[PDB]
Amino acid sequence: LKADPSEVEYYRSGGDGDYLKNNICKITVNHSDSGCEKKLPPICVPPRRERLCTYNFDKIRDNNAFLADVLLTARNEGEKIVQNHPDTNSSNVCNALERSFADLADIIRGTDQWKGTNSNLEKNLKQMFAKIRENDKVLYTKLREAWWNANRQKVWEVITCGARSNELCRKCGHYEKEVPTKLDYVPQFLRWLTEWIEDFYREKQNLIDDMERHREECTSYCSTCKDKCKKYCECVKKWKTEWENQENKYKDLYEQNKNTSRYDDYVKDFFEKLEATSRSKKKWIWKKSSGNEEGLQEEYANTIGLPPRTQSLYLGNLPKLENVCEDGCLIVSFHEGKNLKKRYPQNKNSGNKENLCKALEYSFADYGDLIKGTSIWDNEYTKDLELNLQNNFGKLFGSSLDELRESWWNTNKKYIWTAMKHGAEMNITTGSGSSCDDIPTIDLIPQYLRFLQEWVENFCEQRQAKVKDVITNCKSCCKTKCKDECEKYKKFIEACGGIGTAGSPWSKRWDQIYKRYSKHIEDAKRNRKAGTKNCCVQSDIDSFFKHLIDIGLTTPSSYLSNVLDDNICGADKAPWTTYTTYTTTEKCDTLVVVNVPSPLGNTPYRYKYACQCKIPTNEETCDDRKEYMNQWSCKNDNYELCKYNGVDVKPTTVRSNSSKLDGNDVTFFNLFEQWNKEIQYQIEQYMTNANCKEKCKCYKLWIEKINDQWGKQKDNYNKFRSKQIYDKVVSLSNFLFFSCWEEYIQKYFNGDWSKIKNIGSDTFEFLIKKCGNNSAHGEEIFNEKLKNAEKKCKENESTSCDLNATNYIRGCQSKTYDGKIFGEKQWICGACIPPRTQNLCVGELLLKEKIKNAIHKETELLYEYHDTGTAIISKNDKKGQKGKNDPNGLPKGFCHAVQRSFIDYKNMILGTSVNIYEHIGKLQEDIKKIINAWWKGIEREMWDAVRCAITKINKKNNNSIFNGDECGVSPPTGNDEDQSVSWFKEWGEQFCIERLRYEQNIREACTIDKIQGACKRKCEKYKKYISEKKQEWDKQKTKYENKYVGKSASDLLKENYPECISANFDFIFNDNIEYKTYYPYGDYSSICSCEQVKYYKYNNAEKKNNKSLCYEKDNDMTWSKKYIKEGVYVPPRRQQLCLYELFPIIIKNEEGMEKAKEELLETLQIVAEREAYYLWKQYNPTGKGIDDANKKACCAIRGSFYDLEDIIKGNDLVHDEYTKYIDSKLNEIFGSSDTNDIDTKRARTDWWENETRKTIRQLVWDAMQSGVRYAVEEKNENFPLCMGVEHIGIAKPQFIRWLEEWTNEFCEKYTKYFEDMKSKCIECKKACANYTNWLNPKRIEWNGMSNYYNKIYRKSNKESEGGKDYSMIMAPTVIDYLNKRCHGEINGNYICCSCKNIGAYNTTSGTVNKKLQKKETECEEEKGPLDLMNEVLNK
Structure with missing residues (x-):
């Protein structure tokens, strides 16, 4: 052991350092300074040479890369020796593994017996040692020993990570022991001799057994027998000669014998030394099993426990030998049947007809999983049972051994199950001892899920037992007689000292189970490439969990809800998905909120604030709903802090009244500053937002709460003003006005722009109206807002004519509409003047009757013309009058036109700020000079006349029922002015209709490479139309922004008209320079040009891909929650991604997957490359050579890549102008309308992941890397190290990345x-x-x-x-x-x-x-x- 650490480097020609450090063996070929081809089909010539690698000059940074390379070599050797399986007997499979590990370790400047080109390896190792020894610290051998110790401690946990065949066991060596198990610190000669003799024995014993079997299999065999005997005698004498040669070599070594290579000295020392049946119940063990102790395995440590049934099984007693006996292929089945028949009475102790069938199912499943060899209970009689089973199967069935075990289990499970029901005479295969289910009784589920189900059922039985008594005594009948049961249930739920849980709170066990489930899901989703739907995976833990993740049972609660049925858990209908939060559990002064599943909870489900025998507490009902909530807790009459729920108000500790203003009052000022903004935002949100009885009850409670809080805050501000005057502070109204102005300036103006006075002329009206007038009226606006908020619910909770007026047909005739049916008018953009507004049935101009007749005639003419059919406002095919038919039976857009005409007439009679002809203005001014309940009465009379006209038209036509309610009898109730907005809406509708018509014409006449036919004229006309409409839209949008600066025009124009769903005004009316060169045809270059798109890689000629609409990224943006389909904000990065190239192809393709796939792939590659290039150029200005900037740029690029992946996969949260149509068209293309959205999403995910060479993910990543290289090329710098990595982990939910x-x-x-x-x-x-x-x-x-x-x-x-x-x-x-x-x-x-x-x-x-x-x-x-x-x- 030594203190020198290693394997902590980063980006050394590999993935990353974060992947390692978890004691894992994922290390790939990369990171080893290079990016084992020498593999054989399998004095002395041992096989070491065929189980070694040569993957091992100033390129390495430090010892980290060398250690990583050696670890990679060891992992590759382990994987090779495991996958190859030279001996599938599973008896000695890792002995060769450890021998090869020892050989590889000795190869590091040690006893080398390699006969060949072994000089290069030793030379490289010596050079590496010299390089690491450049720093002189301690007087070569010391560093070598330290490195050897580090390798010994580390690689033993990496090389053995693959094999799991078998004092802990169940894994050869130890992947989790944290200390080496056994070291082959013996001379290589003796180890090689031992391996040779072991191989000879294993071969010859098996061959003689096979020959003995074949001798009786027959019935010139004698000749073959004698030939084999002679060959084996030759082998034996050859082995004897080899043994004699080894003995002679040892004698020569001993004769030659007659800290300076310590290995050799120890070898010499060793050479000199040599020369000189009833089990009681259990407690649901939840702890890892020791060498000879019950409990789970290391991987399932602290996971679901073992039920008493598993620990009492007959099989888990000793090796496979019957108790009563003194001792083939078919004998195993008979032994299993006898064991099953003996086990059946043991489980027969519990006499039931419903609790016994499930127990038998679980016992059968556990027997199957133990026979296969994938158990985790691992009691003291499991390590030897698997070894005995392997030995028995080797001599009876000796692809793989696990597959053979699975096949045998699947074949014999029928008899195994039929033998566990009092079966003595096996029939060919109810009336037996038990009738659990049918013969198959399929229970092919991992032991983890079955254990979880059994534990949940055991807990739910006790839960039902308790809640039955709790309910029978607390069924709304409970002064003192009910509190006892409720307290008992609470104690049972939280008892850190019933059956199971190993004397621990249920919450900790549930958390551990959830953590294990999440780990299983992650393992099956990330590191598992062999998914489901494979030629329906037969059986595997990862494969099964993939099915659950695809279905949606990601969390254990969903699986428990799906599995459990009949609501046996408590019998009170307590769901498992719903979560309950209780204050805390005192068991094992401070309260910690605990959130668990509903069944666990703290009391019977839906018994909160009722288990105590109290009143309903309507306030508690409103609070618990988690809707319309306020997180504020507002005779001395000093101060009311109104501390926000959470952090408590603290003294400033620095305020001083000596030669200052005041102290301790700044906290109140800050609290009020936060409050007047939070409450304003909440009020606005609840105003924009709409069983309703309880909703308004909670809403009114919230209104009263906020009113009381506002009153308290006003009193506090008055006290603050008095205190300040005691020693100048602005008043409450002034503070509110300043807050309104600052809030409106910060969002739009950048950092309180110096010239606040200079603002749009139209925006001044809005600012003065919604903040207030010049005089301070801050309180009045807040009071009005509160009144409006109250009125919102106040309104929400609420839920003859026979005279013939057709006799005066004179003055007005058929108007010249926008068509040639026998001279067409166009827009004149104050803002605009629609064509219908300039000419109307006003040829006549007592007055009231004349106006009524004029409007009657105008409406009649409009209706007649609309019935005749036109292509100006109604959409129709070539034939006309078909397909588009209003359900009421009237033309399209008639109601809108009538409403617009009525609004125009109302404005004309009222004479508002409307731009019209000068003579018309003089006429209306004179009319006003000659002459408002009377106006309302006149409007009502006009509406009645219109209704009478509609009734007369219906009577004369008799097509349907129409009593003036074709679209609504009430007048236009639009709060916003209907003069400019109505004109804008009409212009938008006309643009929608004309754009759709142009699309149809182009796609019908320009579908089937330059342009020489009719495409040129059509596309040129469309270009001129788009230019005119772009000027018009620019003017109208400027007017709207000057008028409405908060809301957008595109959303309003597209939400009120389903016609414009494929129209993107941002792209159609782009003001950039590239919009006229790269896309000169206005969103239809891909169609008018009839060309093909392609992505050109780095290795190509000068024909680069510089055709994009990407704009240089901005840094002064802010987070916005707009365009989202709650409480989630879109980062500025997502609001700048390039999606301009996707829209043209998206609208181009329709049911054309064959070409749409390639189009989308190429365009996505181009977009990703451009985005990466621009992000890199943004985050590294002036070509600064820093590391943190590079890391930030790489993180931003990865975030953009994840956002693109989510957009393509349909897991996006924001619905912008681009994304909405992109997702719509992607759904329309993939699958079809009949297929459910789930199928389309699965198809999209599969297409993104796999090709159906390289995947789309890898292609996009390579495109981004090429873009980063292009960005770097302009600065002549080094290629970043955080972009040269290919493998990337699975993206987390978009919300998590946004939060990070x-x-x-x-x-x-x-x-x-x-x-x-x-x-x-x-x-x-x-x-x-x-x-x-x-x-x-x-x-x-x-x-x-x-x-x-x-x-x-x-x-x-x-x-x-x-x-x-x-x-x-x-x-x-x-x-x-x-x-x-x-x-x-x-x-x-x-x-x-x-x-x-x-x-x-x-x-x-x-x-x-x-x-x-x-x-x-x-x-x-x-x-x-x-x-x-x-x-x-x-x-």
């Missing part, structure tokens, strides 16, 4: 800002302002992330809110998941976060309670004057 990125960014920003502030704190004011501005939203972000994490922290596919797997989390809460994950340095492969905030301070760092104590009063005193200056400037 958020934590890393927050820690980096915190460190930067705190260092800047402390080193400068007259610049402390700006530092404090920046710190507060950056920290204010992070608190809300962290709260949302923590809430979402707690929602699905350890859920599964069928348990989590979303359709995603989260069983790998295994984290009690968010904070502890960030511990040990953001502790070490950044590595670039796995570790991508570093934070010096491991403790429970992130929830406090979000506030200013502790970390900002020394700079709290200072920052407050800078903000005060800043607030005053900003307020006076705004005022």
